[PDB]
Design a binder for this molecule. Structure first.
Ligand code: MG
Length: 244
């Protein structure tokens, strides 16, 4: 990880992710309003779910879109999860690492495809949310998804869901968030990712968390439990919030 900038120059940049969010250093920006999400509600349709060797990824339709403060529209591409089995999340908050972090990856609609956007300035945006566990009951919006993990145990296996509710897989409060400009968390570490980190958490049961952490195998046939990149310096960035 120390070596990344040798061959991937963006990794030696000033706007790298993930970061630790220190809440005392966050700036309230009243001109930030909502994420303006449309098309994420419960719907029928085909939602491919794959074990890619590193995570489970769910492909999303291009009718899922969010509009940021300046009017840029970002198109949903895929959703995936970061876990440990606390060693799960990439981002930390006030030094606290969470059990799982959920990422919805979007691309800027000014580009013709995800693949073009990935190498473009302002090409990407990620909606991120943490999971919290306590003594919560089963989160019913995860029940089908969790049940299908058993079908993609080996890398490259795929399964479909014919209905999903992405909005209600996210935290109950979708109004409040932190935002900053950052990068991919692995090489090539491209610095074109607008991050939105939700303030509210997703509640999962302990069993749900255990199943996510213990269901999938990697290419070496071992249970998936991968090393996060350390948090990176803010440098000249200031994390902003759309609430006091
Ligand atoms: Mg991710």
């Amino acid at each position: 990880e120390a070596h990344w900038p040798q061959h991937y120059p963006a990794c030696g940049g000033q706007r790298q992710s993930p970061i630790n969010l220190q809440r005392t250093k966050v700036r309230y920006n009243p001109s930030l309003k909502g994420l303006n999400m449309t098309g994420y509600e419960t719907q029928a349709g085909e939602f491919p779910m794959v074990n890619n060797g590193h995570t489970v990824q769910i492909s999303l339709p291009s009718t899922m879109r969010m509009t940021v403060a300046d009017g840029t529209v970002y198109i949903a591409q895929q959703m995936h999860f970061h876990w440990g089995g606390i060693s799960g999340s990439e981002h930390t908050v006030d030094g606290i690492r969470h059990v799982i972090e959920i990422h919805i990856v979007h691309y800027n609609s000014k580009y013709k495809s995800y693949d073009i956007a990935q190498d473009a300035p302002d090409g990407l945006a990620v909606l991120a949310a943490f999971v919290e566990v306590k003594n919560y009951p089963e989160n019913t919006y995860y029940s089908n998804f969790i049940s299908h993990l058993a079908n993609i145990k080996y890398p490259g296996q795929r399964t479909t869901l014919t209905g999903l509710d992405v909005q209600d897989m996210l935290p109950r409060n979708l109004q409040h968030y932190y935002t900053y400009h950052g990068s991919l968390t692995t090489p090539p570490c491209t610095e074109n990712v607008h991050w939105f980190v939700l303030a509210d958490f997703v509640k999962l049961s302990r069993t749900q968390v255990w199943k996510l952490e213990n269901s999938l195998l990697d290419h070496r046939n071992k249970t998936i439990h991968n090393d996060y990149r350390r948090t990176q310096p803010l440098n000249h960035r200031v994390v902003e919030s759309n609430f006091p």
